[PDB]
Write a protein that binds this ligand. Structure first.
Ligand SMILES: Nc1nc(O)c2nc(CNc3ccc(C(=O)O)cc3)cnc2n1
Ligand SMILES: Nc1nc(O)c2nc(CNc3ccc(C(=O)O)cc3)cnc2n1
Ligand SMILES: Nc1ncnc2c1ncn2[C@@H]1O[C@H](COP(=O)(O)O)[C@@H](O)[C@H]1O
Ligand SMILES: Nc1ncnc2c1ncn2[C@@H]1O[C@H](COP(=O)(O)O)[C@@H](O)[C@H]1O
Ligand SMILES: Nc1nc2c(c(=O)[nH]1)N=C(CO)CN2
Ligand SMILES: [Ca+2]
Ligand SMILES: [Ca+2]
Ligand SMILES: [Mg+2]
Ligand SMILES: [Mg+2]
Ligand SMILES: [Mg+2]
Lengths: 549, 549
């Protein structure tokens, strides 16, 4: 046993994990805590799915902050975290192609015997659930793991569950292994021996009976929509030996089956979630206003915070604060740094708020030093990185603490405010931008940023002719599966669509922006970045009322 | 030959190719059918139709030969003869040779199969009518018709039915001079060659789409002995079969027209801004400041200006000393001159006969906006026919007056009672020879409606998809209910109206009556441009290109 389960040599395996909770109000905190412990005790998170609200799947053939106290009382992993950015992952590529990995230390079964044994568990379980309420919140994760084998991983996983005391963590795959092991009898000091390999130990009694069998792939992989739903996000092309098709085909048949033989439409009550700060947002259910706070003429901290408060009351859900202009052909005031403009205002807002519904704060920056200071001093919620984190990808390290994750807007542009209007050739405008953003998400997701925390922005007016900016909006449907953030507010292209002189075109432009708000409303754009919050709020309130039947 | 004095029901077809002047043409045609044949008691819409396979008239009106009969301009509740025609009850025997049921079938089919050969060696502007006729026979009709055809100089008047009759015949001054009081000798020599035969019903009646389309407007439930079904059933089968067999949506090239002044307007193709000029908005009225605003509005983007001296806003006290026509007629008079010193249509918001008579006489207005759907003084309908020229009309639903309406709020079925009410109203004007294509529907937002009821009327605006639709939401209390002080509420209200503009835009509402023209115009311009899609295939074509790269 010590020769193989606890062998000296360090492996690099690929595991695919499923995460569940039943707590709606704390889902993010429960699941992101699980993610941290996974990242801490198992290896490196290299993929995540969206977060979903899922209808319970019991039959196949049809509130407290002790977590935060746990998070200051953890044993150290015997394995080191490396936060360095990676570009690729060999073992992961091998996993997906299904190619040649090490032999399993745990005895495998063939397809026939897997199918008989998986099948058996289901009928037993179906009739059990036949004889004898709340939504599930689900998430899948690919971990590049240093744990030797699936059984050892399940042990560590069980520890993670007891520590968190609400949470359910399943191993879906482990390399290309087919494993069915029926009557696991694990010794009280075997569990300790396993845990000690991976953790510097300072519960074990509970675990002994909790592992009765091991199935790889998990029994319910092909039988739960909610699982297939999550896997389709991460590994759509994957074909394990024990599966009839790729994950995408399996997901697709399941959608069309519920439609062609049950007339259900299964997507309707299995909602995709994104996360702006710490609450659940249902994808495509609200057009949130993001109020613009431009800090540069120098804008005084007190006046700027006044403007923030005004915006909250005008109905902004998110304030985007920026001290470095991206507007065409500008150059900043050299006398005063981005941080000097930005940080004081955010410090003053935090003081002025704490004296007293709290707006989410986004910082429009591409600069590591500025974002580091903001995050250290709990001043911000979201990075609005207009370079899609390409200017300094080290900024991605700042999006993860331990317990906490930060959300991020990824925007498309080329060049800078002086060059961008010239950088306007695209072979396939709509899809070049779309593919660029997906590629940027992939890189973030490979580097452990949760998928459901990443927002897409097409960068209107940035290296786009006015007709091109229009075409991007005409084809906004292309982002129907994704959290979407856009900024049209007061841009030159609005004016290009139109027919005291100086103050007149100013007005037509704000008024034209409200047409794009209306359009965004009907296209179900998740976030809109605007200067004129009150006007935008008035439009959206009325459009919302016309929809309440 | 030409003896007795009787009354018959006569369905006509009216055609033209002159798109630019189809109104001036067909309404001269209509009036000559009013002078020389009897009384117009039904019309269909104007239609631009595909033929299925792919300045002198002003003086002609001063010099017309008068009918032997008198023009009865007075209103009617119903027509007994027309009601008999519709059920095919007992009418007189024909003063012409009527053929049997199975012989007409064979005699018509040869004229069809002969005629798709002589043709086999532009746009159609169609309009049907129903006439209470003093003429005793189809042929004497066709005689005065071809006289009318020739008397113009581009016009094809046909007879589609004549009571219950089934006629075929193979092959004048005495007819003309006993119906009408006599270079007039170019006519009779043309006519003798021009008239060749007579078929009742008309030959193409059951084959041409352009006719079933027109007949569906006027007489849906009408069933001839000849035709194997009701007009509605034939029409709906023609639509259903062009879809099932040929895969054509047959409506798309056969467009319903409404008319605001003298030009063509394609139903549902444009949301027109109607600028509000309410003269009664301290103690002195400024007739020059109001023409200022008319011009300001034209420049701001108004197609139409609605002027009213009488206010119908809630609980309004009408100016006790100065009258409606002194508020309105000189403000209009000033306008007419300074314009003569791209001409906007002028709508007068009045229920008052004398005011409209005075505006119509002095060429000051094109449209009657009647907020009582002409129930205050049904006689006002008579002023919509200066027998040469016609005028269009907005018919609006309300109950009570500005002090009682807020209470008058119980409907049996809100949406449909109002639709039925306006339809009945249209039927009245039509039965009295107001051309169908000149009657606009208004649901009267805020007029005897609770705020939720104004919203419910909008939610269900699709119910008017067949009809020209004029609405007025601008600045009404219901907008506000949906959402250094008191300044906000004014702004919020205007900004929330722009939502309704946008909704109106997408719901294809034909006219919107607004205060804030510029703001509205800006929203409509941007929405229009977003819908201006260069290639309708490109979104799937670009998507495929991307998936292949
Ligand atoms: N995520 C995000 N998304 C934007 O759209 C954005 N825009 C600006 C402002 N930048 C511009 C760019 C172009 C133009 C013009 O052509 O007028 C104007 C302003 C700043 N931060 C931004 N952040
Ligand atoms: N065709 C037409 N269609 C209208 O909608 C309209 N409205 C007014 C203005 N009347 C009102 C009624 C209600 C309200 C409120 O609730 O605020 C305000 C103004 C005047 N002429 C009108 N003419
Ligand atoms: N691949 C697997 N992942 C997680 N649990 C498993 C797996 N195979 C078997 N099990 C067992 O299934 C139970 C997990 O709890 P539940 O999710 O309620 O079934 C435990 O007894 C596990 O040992
Ligand atoms: N029901 C009918 N109405 C009008 N003209 C008819 C009818 N039946 C036969 N005709 C004749 O057929 C010709 C048809 O003309 P058109 O339809 O303009 O090609 C006319 O010149 C008439 O003399
Ligand atoms: N949708 C959904 N249904 C379930 C889940 C789950 O995670 N999601 N877990 C279960 C027992 O582990 C039983 N049923
Ligand atoms: Ca790690
Ligand atoms: Ca008459
Ligand atoms: Mg579960
Ligand atoms: Mg489980
Ligand atoms: Mg003809």
């Amino acid at each position: 046993i010590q020769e193989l389960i606890l062998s000296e040599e360090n492996k690099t395996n690929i595991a695919v994990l499923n995460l569940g909770t039943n707590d709606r109000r704390n889902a993010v905190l429960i699941l992101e805590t699980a993610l941290h412990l996974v990242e801490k005790y198992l290896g490196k998170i290299i993929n995540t799915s969206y977060l979903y609200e899922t209808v319970p799947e019991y039959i196949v053939l049809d509130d407290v902050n002790y977590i935060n106290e746990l998070m200051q009382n953890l044993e150290e992993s015997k394995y080191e975290e490396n936060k360095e950015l990676i570009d690729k992952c060999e073992e992961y590529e091998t996993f997906l192609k299904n190619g040649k990995v090490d032999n399993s230390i745990l005895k495998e079964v063939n397809v026939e015997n897997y199918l008989l044994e998986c099948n058996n568990i289901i009928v037993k379980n179906d009739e059990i659930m036949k004889n004898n309420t709340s939504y599930f919140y689900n998430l899948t994760v690919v971990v590049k793991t240093f744990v030797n084998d699936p059984l050892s991983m399940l042990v560590v996983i069980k520890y993670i569950e007891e520590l968190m005391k609400i949470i359910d963590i399943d191993i879906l795959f482990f390399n290309d292994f087919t494993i069915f092991m029926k009557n696991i009898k694990l010794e009280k000091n075997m569990i300790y021996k396993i845990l000690s390999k991976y953790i510097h130990l300072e519960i074990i009694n509970n675990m002994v009976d909790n592992i009765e069998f091991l199935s790889i792939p998990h029994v319910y992989t092909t039988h739960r929509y909610s699982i297939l739903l999550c896997l389709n996000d991460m590994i759509p092309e994957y074909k394990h030996n024990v599966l009839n098709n790729t994950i995408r085909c399996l997901y697709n048949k399941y959608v069309s089956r519920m439609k062609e033989q049950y007339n259900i439409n299964i997507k309707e009550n299995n909602k995709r979630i994104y996360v702006l700060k710490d609450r659940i947002s249902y994808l495509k259910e609200k057009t949130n206003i993001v109020g613009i706070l431009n800090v540069n003429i120098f804008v005084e901290p007190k006046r700027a915070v006044q403007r923030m408060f005004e915006m909250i009351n005008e109905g902004a859900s998110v304030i985007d604060i920026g001290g470095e202009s991206s507007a065409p052909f500008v150059i900043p005031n050299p006398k005063i740094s981005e941080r000097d403009l930005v940080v004081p205002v955010l410090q003053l807002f935090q003081k002025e708020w704490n004296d007293i519904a709290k707006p989410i704060i986004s910082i429009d920056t591409i600069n590591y030093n500025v974002f580091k200071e903001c995050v250290d001093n709990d001043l911000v919620d979201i990075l609005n990185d207009i370079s899609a984190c390409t200017n300094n990808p080290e900024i991605i390290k700042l999006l993860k603490k331990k317990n906490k994750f930060y959300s991020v807007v990824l925007m498309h542009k080329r060049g800078n405010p002086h060059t961008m209007d010239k950088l306007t050739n695209y072979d396939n405008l709509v899809y070049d931008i779309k593919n660029y953003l997906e590629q940027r998400l992939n890189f973030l997701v490979l580097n452990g940023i949760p998928r459901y925390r990443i927002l897409f922005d097409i960068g209107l007016g940035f290296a786009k002719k006015h007709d091109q900016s229009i075409k991007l909006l005409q084809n906004i449907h292309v982002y129907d599966e994704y959290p979407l953030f856009i900024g049209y507010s007061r841009k030159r292209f609005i004016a290009h669509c139109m027919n005291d002189k100086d103050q007149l075109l100013y007005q037509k432009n704000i008024c034209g922006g409200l047409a794009i708000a209306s359009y965004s409303y009907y296209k179900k754009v998740d976030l809109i970045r605007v200067h004129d919050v009150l006007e935008t709020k008035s439009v959206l309130d009325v459009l919302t009322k016309i929809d309440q039947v």
